[PDB]
Design a protein around this nucleic acid. Structure first.
Lengths: 70, 129, 56, 53, 152, 67, 185, 132
RNA sequence: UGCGAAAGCAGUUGAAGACAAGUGCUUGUCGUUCGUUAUAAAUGGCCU
């Protein structure tokens, strides 16, 4: 599994150990393990071969607001 | 770069603020009109507040604060509030969305969205060849 | 200048005053020689940085 | 130019004078004259290029 | 409009508060006054700038303690004008010591950019050539000094 | 002995040459003294250089993931 | 009151504001009456970003209380000034000083705020429009500011001349507010 | 050269006292000191030992006519300056202080030698003029 | 920090308490004390 900034792998034959800026969602919508965030931002991810992983990543003037340094 | 508050019934200037260093491209206000937010070329968002009861009685706005959150121009800005939401959403030439809280704009946290969220994929790879 | 001192050295010894009459030479030479310790320091820094990028 | 007397302190008398200049003079009221120059507008100099009126 | 000629010759009191007109300041001085350290450095190396007037802004920035601060946001494109003048300023006795301070910082502040930028590299090869030449002149001046002491 | 703190000795030597004067000094000895001092100057320059030194993304990359 | 770290008295001389360790809490009290009695922790005024940053952002070096008691100015070692509305604890940030602010004083009306610090520059903040007027190249850093007069005719300043490390060289300056010229040094 | 390189490696692993003799061996030549420093000095302990023996040797006799030991110091500083400063040993700092003191004297002498060298240049020319 | 010339020559940078954060333990702090001669970073730059 992969998202915009993360990649994960889950083994489905193994169970896991049991041990502000969004809507609070009080209302309804209608009416063995590997995790990495080193690779980001990702356009696409997939396997080329059994041991090859293809990770595709993304590589103007602005009003100057100086940063003071002493 | 000036923000000016006019009286509608008389069409006269009540207050003038020289806030931004360049063009002010967009304005927005909260539901109760207690806050007015401005943004523009200078990459800053200014908050103008009239929340204090004395301010409401006198009808005087105060330049409460500003924040530098964008790497380039801020062309668009909008606000939404509800019982479970308080959003100040801005975006511009940086091509990314920035989310703030209206009530806690000065001291709240903010989120900078990824430029590309590939919900629809623009790239494919073929295992063979 | 080097030949003037070489050839007429005997005469320049037997002259009442040297500093007043050669004040220009003493000032001119003093200005250059005083820069020497700083120039060597710049030379060492330039030589160090030049070597690093040549070998790489 | 115009006289001015404080409405509360009757003793305070002053004369204000102005012209096509970016400053204004005040003369408090005989060996010398106590003259002050008003020349500062506190961020609003653009709106005011003369004190003449 | 008739009263402008009058100079108050018949009046009891004459009051003068007009401040004398000061000479217009140059661009580099305005930038230093407004704390524009980087722009003040750029104004130093402009075409048709007096050599002595270029030496002052370098000395002022050093005096203000703003030598690294003036050199942060720079690359090869905007570093060469400083190095071009340093290539010529090293020769003069007056500006030799100041050139050493500024060239020392730029090397210590842009060592990595040096390796990847070819055009800058030649600016240090030829600068190395010239400082070595100045070394020979300064060593030589010591020798004429030594023999001159012998005569006296 | 010189040819065979040291600055105070060398500085003392420089005083001797002034005291000896121009006429007195002899060519054969001057050659040996000249060779000695040239060696010192080169050594002096070498140590000065040491003293100053003491004072002083790719489009494609292939990597192995750690899992 | 116990463990008083910092204290200030209004220009009228009728309100006292102080800060204690009971981290710390600010309390305002009317002296000759019981009309004003307020207390609140410093944490409420302080911004969260300050909590993230170094201690200079959370360390108050100056404090001022309005004659009416509606406003209170707090100055921080980082150089930031915060005006707090005592009715509802609403904060307003005024940021010009790059180093610690050493002196704050409200005007009699409360519409202006004198500030001074290491910059050797006295700043009159016009709070109506947030603008500011300047009096720079003062002889020393401004330890203290005050508006002196029924109509604010004069400003009294204390200057330090921090160049002399051997002694504290104070200089008392009385400026004519009309043209900001030294009436008496 | 390869033999002197490999034996230098082994002595360094063995903490031998014969490191100095290895470094002084006349077979060492200017590029090979770079290759040995670049390729073989991979561990900080190896670097520190070479710096310590060199710094000590130069300190005792900074006026040795042998230019090899200084040549090792020059390139060791030029190529491995960051890794050397990464060493936090106090004795390393003290050795650096001693080495700096010994070299610092030599700097002060150079103006005097150049002055003497100037006088001798006049004396030789006047002798030649007399001969002619 | 002491001495001295400016160069340098010797020598230090410790302990307790309290607080915060993370997870009794770890780290960082001190408008707290005892003893010894003993990076910064709130977009924040100077009038007429």
């Amino acid at each position: 599994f992969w998202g915009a900034t993360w990649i994960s792998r889950i083994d489905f034959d193994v169970d896991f150990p049991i041990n502000g800026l969004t809507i609070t969602d009080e209302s309804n919508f209608m009416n063995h393990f590997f995790f990495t965030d080193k690779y980001k931002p990702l356009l696409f991810v997939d396997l080329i071969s059994s041991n090859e992983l293809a990770i595709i990543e993304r590589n103007q003037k602005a009003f100057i607001q100086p940063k003071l340094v002493f | 770069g000036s923000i000016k508050f006019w009286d509608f019934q008389f069409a006269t200037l009540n207050q003038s603020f020289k806030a931004h260093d360049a063009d002010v491209l967009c304005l927005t206000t909260d539901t109760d009109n207690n806050y007015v937010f401005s943004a523009g070329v200078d990459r800053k968002i200014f908050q103008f507040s009239q929340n204090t009861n004395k301010s409401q009685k006198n009808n005087r706005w105060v330049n409460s604060s500003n924040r530098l959150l964008h790497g380039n121009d801020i062309r668009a800005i909008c606000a939404y509030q509800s019982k479970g939401a308080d959003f100040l959403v801005s975006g511009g030439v940086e091509k990314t969305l920035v989310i703030n809280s209206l009530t806690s704009f000065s001291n709240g946290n903010y989120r900078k969205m990824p430029t590309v969220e590939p919900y629809s994929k623009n790239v494919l790879v073929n295992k063979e060849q | 200048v080097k030949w003037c001192l070489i050839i007429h050295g005997g005469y320049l010894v037997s002259i009442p005053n040297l500093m007043s009459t050669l004040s220009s030479l003493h000032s001119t030479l003093k200005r250059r020689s005083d820069l020497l310790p700083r120039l060597l320091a710049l030379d060492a820094r330039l030589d160090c940085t030049i070597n690093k990028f040549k070998t790489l | 130019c115009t006289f001015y007397t404080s409405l509360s302190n009757q003793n305070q008398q002053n004369i204000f004078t102005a012209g096509r200049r970016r400053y204004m003079h005040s003369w408090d009221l005989s060996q010398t004259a106590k003259i002050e120059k008003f020349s500062r507008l506190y961020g609003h100099e653009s709106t005011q290029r003369s004190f003449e009126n | 409009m008739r009263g402008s000629e009058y100079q108050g010759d018949q009046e009891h009191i004459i009051h003068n508060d007009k401040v004398r007109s000061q000479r217009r300041m140059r661009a580099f001085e305005r930038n230093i006054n407004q704390f524009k350290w980087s722009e003040a450095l750029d104004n130093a190396f402009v075409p048709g700038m007096a050599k002595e007037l270029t030496l002052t802004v370098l000395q002022e920035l050093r005096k203000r303690g703003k030598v690294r601060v003036a050199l942060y946001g720079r690359d090869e494109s905007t570093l060469e004008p400083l190095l071009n003048w340093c290539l010529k300023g090293i020769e003069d006795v007056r500006s030799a010591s100041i050139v050493a301070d500024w060239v020392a910082v730029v090397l210590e502040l842009y060592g990595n950019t040096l390796e990847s930028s070819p055009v800058l590299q030649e600016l240090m090869i030829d600068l190395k050539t010239k400082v070595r030449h100045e070394i020979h002149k300064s060593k030589e001046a010591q020798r004429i000094e030594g023999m001159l002491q012998l005569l006296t | 002995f010189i040819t065979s703190q040291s600055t105070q000795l060398f500085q003392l030597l420089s005083l001797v040459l002034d005291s000896i004067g121009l006429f007195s000094l002899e060519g054969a000895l001057l050659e040996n003294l000249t060779l000695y001092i040239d060696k010192q100057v080169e050594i002096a320059e070498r140590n000065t250089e040491l003293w100053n030194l003491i004072d002083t993304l790719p489009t494609y990359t292939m990597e192995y993931l750690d899992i | 009151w116990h463990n008083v770290i910092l204290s200030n008295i209004s220009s009228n001389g009728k309100l006292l504001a102080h800060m204690c360790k009971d981290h710390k809490s600010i309390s305002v009290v009317s002296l000759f009456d019981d009309s004003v009695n307020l207390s609140f922790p410093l944490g409420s005024i302080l911004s969260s970003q300050t909590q993230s940053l170094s201690y200079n952002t959370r360390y108050v070096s100056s404090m001022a209380i309005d004659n009416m008691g509606q406003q209170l100015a707090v100055g921080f070692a980082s150089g930031v000034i915060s005006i707090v509305s005592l009715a509802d604890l609403q904060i307003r940030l005024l940021k010009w000083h790059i180093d610690s602010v050493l002196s704050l004083s409200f005007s009699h009306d409360g519409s202006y705020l004198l500030s001074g610090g290491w910059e050797k520059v006295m700043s009159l903040w016009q709070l109506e429009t947030n603008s500011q007027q300047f009096l720079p190249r003062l002889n020393g850093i401004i330890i203290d500011c005050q508006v002196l007069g029924p109509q604010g005719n004069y400003y009294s300043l204390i200057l330090q001349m921090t160049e002399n490390n051997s002694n504290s060289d104070y200089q008392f300056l009385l400026l004519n507010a009309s043209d900001l010229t030294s009436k008496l040094s | 050269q390869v033999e002197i390189a490999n034996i230098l490696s082994s002595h360094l692993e063995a903490n031998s006292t014969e490191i100095l003799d290895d470094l002084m061996s006349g077979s060492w030549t200017e590029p090979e000191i770079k290759k040995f420093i670049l390729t073989k000095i991979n561990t900080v302990d190896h670097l520190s030992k070479i710096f310590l023996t060199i710094s000590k040797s130069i300190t005792q006799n900074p006026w040795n006519e042998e230019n090899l030991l200084p040549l090792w110091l020059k390139w060791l500083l030029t190529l491995k300056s960051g890794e050397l400063n990464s060493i936090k040993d106090k004795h390393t700092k003290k050795n650096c202080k001693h080495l700096k003191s010994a070299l610092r004297s030599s700097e002060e002498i150079l103006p005097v030698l150049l002055g003497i060298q100037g006088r001798l240049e006049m004396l030789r020319r006047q002798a030649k003029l007399r001969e002619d």
